[PDB]
Swiss-Prot record, chain B:
InterPro entries: Hus1/Mec3. GO terms for cellular component: checkpoint clamp complex; chromosome, telomeric region; nucleus; site of double-strand break. It is found in: Nucleus. It holds the Pfam family Hus1. Present with 414 molecules/cell in log phase SD medium. This is DNA damage checkpoint control protein MEC3. Belongs to the MEC3 family. The keyword Transmembrane does not apply. Gene3D superfamilies: 3.70.10.10. Component of the checkpoint clamp complex composed of DDC1, MEC3 and RAD17. The interaction with MEC3 is performed in a RAD17-dependent manner. The checkpoint clamp complex loads onto DNA. Interacts with the DNA polymerase zeta subunit REV7. Also forms a heterotrimer with 2 RAD17 subunits. Interacts with SET1.
Amino acid sequence: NKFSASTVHLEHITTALSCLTPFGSKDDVLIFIDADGLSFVRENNHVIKIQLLLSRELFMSYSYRNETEDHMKLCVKINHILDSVSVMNRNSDDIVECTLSYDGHGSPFVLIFEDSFISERVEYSTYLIKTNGLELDRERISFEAIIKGEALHSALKDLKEIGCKECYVYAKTEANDENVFALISKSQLG
Amino acid sequence: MKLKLIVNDYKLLRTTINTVASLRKTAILRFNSERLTIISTPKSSSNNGTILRGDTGQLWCTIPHDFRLYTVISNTITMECNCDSLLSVFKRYDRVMNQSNMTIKLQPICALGITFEEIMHSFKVPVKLLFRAQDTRIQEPMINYIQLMMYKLPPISGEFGSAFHGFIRRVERYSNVNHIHLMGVKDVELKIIVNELDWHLEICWNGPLDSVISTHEVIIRCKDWKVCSKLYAAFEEVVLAISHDESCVFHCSLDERGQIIYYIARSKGL
């Protein structure tokens, strides 16, 4: 098996999958396999792209015995994976050891769920590959802000509740410690 | 034609009574002078036995009476009545005991004089007297043993019984399941494969399984697996026989022996 990864903290991969849902829910997903870790890439309408990464440290076993190529790319649909794991999480309270596997080009993406009594095995069909051009230039940053997660989540929820057909962002730091960062919205309220 | 008895083993008879009703309408009660053979088979049932239904599975369960008395005078009597009336009667008796013994009698069309008390309850369920020539056409299927392999399923009361029951019913959580493709490899590993979804699902069992006595495969329907699951839930000694692309037989027993045999034919070709 050119790639094999095992874990029992399935909540992490579950959050990885639920963080990939906003970028459409029935489309193709790119999975990049390299020695450093496991990464999912999604792109929508050539205007926005997400890139989650599961590091090697999240799996006890991470072989990557592939030697001909440094990185492996496969394309699988997300609706299949979502519909499978949805019914697999019915008894998620059991001690489940997920096992990812991939034997190379032309082979399906395997996802084995073993509960020490039942070993469910799923082989996801891999599709042809149509995702980096959408990357900011590291030598041209105009503003760099570090914000807490809860505050940003609350602001985004508020903007959703206001509708927010269009959005604006501000980044001004005046002479003193006057760091101004705002999220203006063009909504029904005005 | 004198048939009288007071059946009180109760679970053994009840599971047959329920499974014949769940299988198809009406049932055959072969009252020998030694052994009772409840035969719910499609050959003897005049409403699309295999016309577009595909209902081919035949059950041959034998119930002993040693249930208080077995006076079968004639001495093989073979009957046929609907399962709804006897289901209701048995349910009423079960509830009554939940709150005496039910006497059973016989009156080519007759009636069954079921009578029990707490109140007085009389139920004259209609029945018939299917002929000896028709009885001879009711013969149990013959199953070869050249490739037939059997899997000693674990008892439900054991530690692994609940896990095996859950694994068996695991195929019921997908509503788009029609055909189940059983697999058995030789310590034997028993596997269930589903190939009717957008993803290839294989439900395996890595627990301990005993093979009383080459991959044998058989594709059956989902309802047959439901009744197999119900039988496994209601029995301890359960043997799964798998004929390679011929048939699947579910052998249950209760320790002469009240064996229950379900013969399921392939619903597809490997």
